[PDB]
Design a protein around this ligand. Sequence first.
Ligand SMILES: [Cl-]
Length: 152
Amino acid sequence: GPHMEMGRRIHLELRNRTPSDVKELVLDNSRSNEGKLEGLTDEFEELEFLSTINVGLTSIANLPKLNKLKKLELSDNRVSGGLEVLAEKCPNLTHLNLSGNKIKDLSTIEPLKKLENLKSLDLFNCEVTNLNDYRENVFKLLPQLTYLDGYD
Ligand SMILES: [Cl-]
């Protein structure tokens, strides 16, 4: 987004504390490193909420292990795949927001079936929401899910 580099945003949040202290981190509108996460490490052992809205993200492959992460907001980026990383890196995730990304088909979100605790998924304004029987087919793909785009 039109703000600071992501690494600089993170360093400012870490003035006078350490990564293991942080519970929530809002990196919205910072600038990713040519499409990639930067500054996030596995030292963030207590992080439960991470927001990286509008950071120009094109890949989540550099997501570190975040075993306590419950909510991940990735809205308004250009993520188009690679979602298998979440089951490896944040296996306890319960809420995922992918609204406004390049999610075009069911195959792209099929890896979310490996997130045992996933309860809520948002895909607002993604191409996949234009598929016939979109809601029905997503719930069949992701039987553990309770809410899609906020309901049923
Ligand atoms: Cl915090």
